[PDB]
Amino acid sequence: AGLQRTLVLIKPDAFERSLVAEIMGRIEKKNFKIVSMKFWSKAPRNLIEQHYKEHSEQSYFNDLCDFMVSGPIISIVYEGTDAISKIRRLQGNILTPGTIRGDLANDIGENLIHASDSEDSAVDEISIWFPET
Amino acid sequence: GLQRTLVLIKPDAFERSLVAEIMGRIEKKNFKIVSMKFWSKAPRNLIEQHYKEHSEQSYFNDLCDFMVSGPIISIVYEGTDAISKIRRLQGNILTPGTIRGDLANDIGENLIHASDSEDSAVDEISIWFPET
Amino acid sequence: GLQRTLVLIKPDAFERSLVAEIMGRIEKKNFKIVSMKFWSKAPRNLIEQHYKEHSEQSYFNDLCDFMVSGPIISIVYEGTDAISKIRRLQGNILTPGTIRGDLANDIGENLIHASDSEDSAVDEISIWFPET
Amino acid sequence: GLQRTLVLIKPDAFERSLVAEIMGRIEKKNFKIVSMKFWSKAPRNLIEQHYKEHSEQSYFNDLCDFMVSGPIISIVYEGTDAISKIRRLQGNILTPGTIRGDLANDIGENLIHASDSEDSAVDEISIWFPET
Amino acid sequence: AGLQRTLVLIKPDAFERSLVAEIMGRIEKKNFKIVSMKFWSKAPRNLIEQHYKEHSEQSYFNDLCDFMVSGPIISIVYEGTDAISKIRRLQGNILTPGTIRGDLANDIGENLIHASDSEDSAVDEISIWFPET
Amino acid sequence: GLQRTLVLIKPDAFERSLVAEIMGRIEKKNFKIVSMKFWSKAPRNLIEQHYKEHSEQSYFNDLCDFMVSGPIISIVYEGTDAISKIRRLQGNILTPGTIRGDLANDIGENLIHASDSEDSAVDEISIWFPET
Ligand SMILES: O=c1ccn([C@@H]2O[C@H](COP(=O)(O)OP(=O)(O)O)[C@@H](O)[C@H]2O)c(=O)[nH]1
Ligand SMILES: O=c1ccn([C@@H]2O[C@H](COP(=O)(O)OP(=O)(O)O)[C@@H](O)[C@H]2O)c(=O)[nH]1
Ligand SMILES: O=c1ccn([C@@H]2O[C@H](COP(=O)(O)OP(=O)(O)O)[C@@H](O)[C@H]2O)c(=O)[nH]1
Ligand SMILES: O=c1ccn([C@@H]2O[C@H](COP(=O)(O)OP(=O)(O)O)[C@@H](O)[C@H]2O)c(=O)[nH]1
Ligand SMILES: O=c1ccn([C@@H]2O[C@H](COP(=O)(O)OP(=O)(O)O)[C@@H](O)[C@H]2O)c(=O)[nH]1
Ligand SMILES: O=c1ccn([C@@H]2O[C@H](COP(=O)(O)OP(=O)(O)O)[C@@H](O)[C@H]2O)c(=O)[nH]1
Ligand SMILES: [Mg+2]
Ligand SMILES: [Mg+2]
Ligand SMILES: [Mg+2]
Ligand SMILES: [Mg+2]
Ligand SMILES: [Mg+2]
Ligand SMILES: [Mg+2]
């Protein structure tokens, strides 16, 4: 088809705010399927630093990593037609109502969800979170 | 600015149990059902008239088969600026906040039809609700 | 244990825009619409047959007027143990978790009717859906 | 950083029972109620103050009659970028995903007011919450 | 009719958990109307002690008052047919799914909502929260 | 005090897209995920262990074939009185307001498993989360 896989992280603010099912349900309602999933009570800093390696020289890098290890996270591989960009549009941004971030988040850092933004980041990010490839 | 527009609820909505969810978004925008029909299986002729504008397109035949692969509801909706507003509500599979935007992920299986103009609306209402 | 049961969506559901909300609770319990009619105003005769068991009660006449005071939907639902299950879903205005339980607050205006037995179900389905 | 902004829940929200729905959307985006008042009927001079930039418009008197036709809630909300984010949440009747986009369908009866700027905010908050 | 008024408090755990609209909406959907409402960023301890005067000799009294002043609360007079008992049944308990407490709360103390439990408590509680009678 | 309990989301939840709905209800009651695994297909000996008190029943093989017919999620949840409260949330197909009451309508395909006692809990958690 146009069948793809993408990588989603549920960030610690989602657990803190009890928005976990709310976020996953929006992705579920658009007809995407869980293909693999892991729950991390605390994620290894090395996994986070890899995941956000492209950001390693930004001002926010260290606080980002701190936050990403500050509570649980769930990593999920989703599957569906055009999954990468469709789930990316679902994530949206804090300025755009209708999307997960648009409806539920209000901060440039604590923003509930990561979604892969291209085939390249998807393959690489899936590799990081699910090395059992 | 009162208008009537024709909506179809497609078989995939029944398959996935999204019927109420879809009608609900239209209800909450304050549009009123003016008439409504349930079809366990729509007559093929009705579907062919409905998508006649499309009889030449490559997807036509698959499209008719899918429209007949399960139940559909035909609904006449009324309200201010209804045609254009229900069209926006329907949206597309790309932009969230809408019916397709939130619930659909296929170019074919996309849950809902809404008339896109005054002419199509009159025509489509007469196909499904010929007693006018 | 497959059964069919008759549901009415009452005018107050239209007044309060709870139509989709009500059909949704039944849809999510996995029952299937088998046939469905929308009435902008139900024929008084139909309402009188429907509530005939009640023609002697003091509330009868007010009840008929209310049933005719706006739109109703007549729905035939199918599924395992449908009659009894949709009855429980309907509930009463006292116990939350149900349709009336959650959404209604009147002994008269209570949003939904559901057949309460095998006999009433056959009878009511034949009143509203006589083409069987 | 943090801002505060003034929201009014308009009389159409009470009538259509959308009060919790509208407040809920603002609540789920993580804004906090700092101040809130319920007015079964808001005093007309308050409404006229609130809408004073509108005093020369043709809809001015009609808007004010509407705003006084049922209850309103005035709320001061606080959170990061509150003025602008709550404005976007309010949206408009052409923009699905927003409060007005999903729930409203009229130029005038559109459920919610939100301050549109730092200055209108500070002003509107002093109108409804002059204690401070 | 059978038209009554009752008094509802939204407790500080509701604000803390962002359940305020969720709780009010359940009461709204059952067709009850707000007749008066006040938001308290912090409620006067004397109001709480009065409100819970019948409990003044229970073990839990002091922690209850502490909690009731630990964050915002909203006091609301609701109106509707049989409002006192119907809104009481809506409140329910932490053991009963379908109700506010049944669905949303899990603690004998932090339980999101108070509703008046009789005509007597209603009149008295309304008096406490809305002396402007 | 705190307890932990084992929940399984059964294959019918995945098929009917109710996974987030079921988890959401447990989430809104303030229980926390301590451990969680997704099994695209659970190994049959795990399922047979899990249901070993059922090994002599007539439905045993059919239950296990079902449990293996699609994905399951196993979750350890934590909160006050978790075992018993989550059991009540699960409810049954006759009890509106619960997960099975609102969403399920079959004796066997009923969406969710929840440990029913301190002992079955500790046992079921060691079956699905033997690391500990
Ligand atoms: O100023 C910033 C920019 C981003 N981030 C975090 O780093 C992630 C990656 O940043 P990006 O701008 O690419 O956001 P995204 O791709 O996730 O939309 C974001 O999700 C934020 O959580 C941050 O903490 N501060
Ligand atoms: O490549 C396509 C495009 C169209 N459709 C179907 O044909 C309908 C009408 O096509 P159109 O482009 O007008 O879609 P719409 O106006 O409904 O967005 C769509 O809703 C689809 O269900 C399809 O099956 N394949
Ligand atoms: O005092 C009453 C009792 C009944 N009803 C109406 O009559 C219907 C049928 O009465 P019944 O007692 O059988 O109610 P149901 O079986 O639907 O719960 C109810 O749904 C109400 O709408 C009424 O108007 N007043
Ligand atoms: O033709 C109009 C224009 C506006 N309004 C009302 O006046 C308010 C202020 O007008 P404005 O165009 O500034 O709307 P807003 O800024 O709230 O989007 C609107 O929200 C409407 O409720 C109206 O009743 N008729
Ligand atoms: O052991 C207890 C009993 C009750 N309460 C609090 O005191 C209120 C009144 O107690 P009651 O048993 O009457 O509960 P309610 O009437 O509110 O259902 C409750 O809502 C709880 O918040 C408490 O903190 N500990
Ligand atoms: O006749 C039956 C009885 C039970 N079960 C399945 O076996 C599980 C365990 O049975 P039990 O009666 O203990 O159900 P539970 O304790 O989960 O409510 C149920 O949840 C069903 O999924 C079944 O398939 N057929
Ligand atoms: Mg990025
Ligand atoms: Mg078109
Ligand atoms: Mg009866
Ligand atoms: Mg403006
Ligand atoms: Mg008590
Ligand atoms: Mg058991």
Interface check for D36 against chain E (CB to CB < 8 A): the answer is yes
Does residue D104 sit at the B interface (CB-CB below 8 Å)?
yes
- Give the C-alpha separation, F51 to F66, whole Å: 12
Is D100 known as a binding-site position?
Answer: yes
Q: How far apart are CA A112 and CA D115, in angstroms?
A: 27
Distance CA A116, CA A126 (A): 9
Q: B31: number of CA atoms within 13 Å, CB side?
A: 32
Q: 10 Å Cβ neighbour count for C75?
A: 26
Q: Which strand (E) or helix (H) includes residue F90? A: helix F82-90
3-state secondary structure of D107: coil
Question: What is the spatial distance between Cα B78 and Cα B2, in angstroms, rounded to a whole number?
Answer: 7
Q: What is the DSSP string of B5-68?
A: EEEEE-HHHHHTT-HHHHHHHHHTTT-EEEEEEEESS--HHHHHHHTGGGTTSTTHHHHHHHHT
Cβ-Cβ pairs closer than 8 A, A with F, add up to 53
| Cross-strand pairs, E81 | E3
Alpha-carbon span C129 to E86, nearest angstrom:
36
Q: Was B37 annotated as part of a binding site?
A: no
With the most atoms of ligand 3 within 8 angstroms of its CB, the residue from C54, C61, C68, C124 to mutate is: C54
Closest CA to D7 of D123, D115, D101: D115
Residue E93 to residue E89: CA distance in whole angstroms = 9
> Residue C21, SS3?
helix
Phi, psi of B108 (to 5 degrees): -110, -55
Distance CA F58, CA C57 (A): 50
Residue A115 backbone dihedrals phi, psi, to 5 degrees: -125, 140
Distance (Å, rounded) from C-alpha D81 to C-alpha D86?
A: 8
For chain E, give the number of residues: 133
Enumerate residues 6+ apart whose C-beta is below 8 A from E38.
D37, D38, E74, E75, E129, E130
Helix E20-29, helix E83-91: angle, nearest 10:
140
| Gaps in chain B (C to N distance exceeding 2.5 A) after | none
> Tell me, what DSSP letter sits at residue C54?
G
Q: What is the DSSP string of B52-112?
A: GGGTTSTTHHHHHHHHTSS-EEEEEEEEETHHHHHHHHH--SSSTTSHHHHH---SS--SE
Q: Which chain residues have CB less than 5 Å from ligand 10, an ion?
A: D 116
Catalytic annotation, residues of A: 114
Method: X-ray
Edge to edge, the sheet with strand D72-80 lists D112-114, D2-9, D72-80, D32-39, E33-40, E73-81, E3-10, E113-115
CB E62 within 8 A of CB E45: no
Neighbours of chain A (3+ CB pairs under 8 A): B, D, F
Q: Which residues line ligand 6 (CB under 6 A)?
A: F 59, 63, 107-108, 110, 113, 116
**What is the distance, to the nearest Å, from the Cα of residue C57 to the centroid of all Cα atoms in its chain?**
19
Pick from A88, A79, A91: which is nearest to A130 by CA? A79
CA neighbours within 13 Å on the CB side: how many for B105?
25
Distance between CA C63 and CA E54 in Å, rounded? 44
Phi then psi for residue D34, to 5 deg, are: -100, -40
Contact indicator for E12, E73 with CB cutoff of 8 Å: yes
Residue showing tokens 């390249």: A120
Pick the closest to residue A67 from A42, A40, A92, A94 (CA basis): A42
Write the CB contacts of E17 (distance below 8 Å, at least 6 apart in sequence).
Answer: A18, E104, E112, F30
Tell me the C-alpha distance between D41 and D71, whole Å.
5
Question: Domains, chain A, ranges and CATH?
Answer: 1-133 (3.30.70.141)
Q: Among partner residues B17, B27, B37, which is closest to C20 by beta-carbon distance?
A: B27
Token couple for A100: 């997960």
Joined tokens for residue D40: 């079964």
Per residue, what are the HEC states of D50-101?
HCHHHCCCCCHHHHHHHHCCCCEEEEEEEEECHHHHHHHHHCCCCCCCCHHH
Sign of CA dihedral C42, C48, C52, C57: positive
Report the candidate in F111, F78, F73 with the shortest Cα–Cα distance to residue A38.
Answer: F73
Of A20, A39, B62, C63, the C-alpha closest to F19 is A20
Distance of alpha carbon B93 from alpha carbon A29, whole angstroms: 12
The encoded tokens of residue F38 equal 């997704």
From E55, E68, E112, the mutation candidate for ligand 5 (largest count of ligand atoms within 8 A of CB) is E55
* Host H or E run for residue D5: strand D2-9
Tokens of D129: 């919450």
CB nearest D96 (choices: B30, B79, B88) = B88
Would you state the structure tokens that stand for residue F1, as one six-digit string?
Answer: 């005090």
B35-74 b/e (C-beta count within 10 Å ≥ 16 → b): bbbbbeebeeebbbebbeeeeeeeeeeebbebbbebbbbb
Ligand 11: distance of its center to the CA of D76 in Å?
32
Contact B108, B59 (CB under 8 A): yes
Q: Which two tokens stand for residue B1?
A: 């600015």
Contact C25/C87 with Cβ under 8 angstroms? no
Q: How far apart are CA D97 and CA D115, in angstroms?
A: 19
For chain C, give the number of residues: 132
Q: Coil, helix or strand for E97?
A: strand
Instruction: Let me know: does C29 contact F103? Beta carbons within 8 Å.
Output: yes
DSSP C87-116: HHHH--SSSTTSHHHHH---SS--SEEE--
| F18: three-class secondary structure by DSSP | coil
Which of D58, D64, D9 has its CA nearest to residue D33?
D9
Cα gap A120→A124, rounded to integer Å: 6
Q: How far is residue E91's CA from residue E113's CA, in Å, rounded to a whole number?
A: 7
Q: Assign residue E31 a region (left: φ > 0; alpha: ψ between -120 and 50; beta: otherwise).
A: left
- Residue (of D3, A29, F88) closest to E106 by Cα position: F88
Please tell me the distance from the alpha carbon of residue A87 to that of residue A74, in angstroms, as a whole number.
Answer: 16
Q: CA B95 to CA A98: how far, in whole Å?
A: 8
Element containing residue A83 per DSSP (H, E): helix A83-91
Contact, C100 vs C91, CB < 8 A? yes
Count of residues in chain B: 132
Name the pairing type of β-strands F2-9 and E33-40: unpaired
Place of tokens 């009963």: E96
Instruction: Compute the distance between CA of residue D31 and CA of residue D11 in angstroms, rounded to an integer.
Output: 22
Residue type, A76: I
Q: Does residue D74 contact residue D20 with C-beta atoms inside 8 Å?
A: no
A63-87 as b/e: b if 16+ CB within 10 A: ebbebbbbbbbbbbbbebbbbbbbb
Identify the H or E element spanning A6: strand A3-10
CA distance C11 to chain B (A): 12
Chain E CB contacts of C93 below 8 Å:
86
CA atoms of A59 and A38, how far apart (whole Å)? 29
Q: Please report, for residues D132, E62, E130, the alpha-carbon distance to residue E55 in angstroms, rounded to integers and kept in the order given.
A: 36, 10, 21
Both tokens assigned to A42 = 């605390």
Nearest to A99 among B96, B105, B106 (CB): B96
Beta strands in chain E (DSSP E): 3-10, 33-40, 73-81, 113-115
The CA-based diameter of chain C, rounded to the nearest angstrom, is: 37
Tokens of A22: 């709310």
Backbone φ and ψ of C36, nearest 5° = -155, 135
- 3-state class (DSSP) for residue A73: strand
CB D111 within 8 A of CB D103: yes
Q: CA E80, CA E115: separation in Å to the nearest integer? A: 14
Which secondary structure element, helix H or strand E, spans residue F10, and what is its range? none
CA dist., res. E83 & res. A80, Å (int): 48
For Cα atoms E84, E85, E86, give the angle at the middle one, nearest 5 degrees. Answer: 95
Residues whose CB falls within 8 Å of the CB of residue A68, separated by 6 or more in sequence, listed in order: A11, A12, A43, A48, A51, A52
Q: Report resolution in angstroms.
A: 2.4
Three-point CA angle C36, C38, C40, nearest 5° = 170
Min Cα separation D58/chain E (Å): 32
Residue A24 in contact with partner chain F when CB distance is under 8 A:
yes
